[PDB]
Amino acid sequence: METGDQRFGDLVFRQLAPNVWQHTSYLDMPGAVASNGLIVRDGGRVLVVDTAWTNDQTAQILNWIKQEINLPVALAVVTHAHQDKMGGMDALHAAGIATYANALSNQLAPQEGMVAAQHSLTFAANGWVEPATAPNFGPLKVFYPGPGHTSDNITVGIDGTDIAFGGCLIKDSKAKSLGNLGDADTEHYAASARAFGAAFPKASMIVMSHSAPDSRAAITHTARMADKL
């Protein structure tokens, strides 16, 4: 934790920009494993990227938003069908928040014992989201970079900031490994990491699932590790 970080229950929140916060929840393994997502203010509403590991943690995220921002959550986008990104879907739905995910994530979620988002995003051949499937997304720019950490992983740039969110695709610049590769596409991983970089070429702060925000060297280090697969 750095000066400025707010502890809220077992969750941590860090302001990254005037309208952007990182939310961090932890899965105790019998050490603790962090998972990061984003909260974005867009005028009189809030937008959320990824849930926490569990429903209770995700409800705590909503409680923090209520206390610190006091604006309604318009929608949440979840970036692939693993527990750290969709483990709290039920809490979003109980709150009446519209949820969005890659159509493939929604198709895979039941096979991971999880609940699909209520709306499906689809993507063009170059990876950009089809606009009709992402209505009223404000500053969220959703990009599917290709298979990598999983076949369904998506990424999100925040328009009007220098922030882009790589999810579990991107590792930090001093990472020793690519994290969990159990569902990974080792053939296409490097190209997908680089496609993420090319989609958001002016983002200087890269946010990822399991490390603190890093420079663009997170993207290049990840791609270089993936070259070795």
Ligand SMILES: [Cl-]
């Ligand atoms: Cl700031």
Ligand SMILES: [Cl-]
């Ligand atoms: Cl296209």
Ligand SMILES: [Cl-]
């Ligand atoms: Cl990972």
Ligand SMILES: [Cl-]
């Ligand atoms: Cl950009």
Ligand SMILES: [Zn+2]
């Ligand atoms: Zn994952």
Ligand SMILES: [Zn+2]
């Ligand atoms: Zn992950």
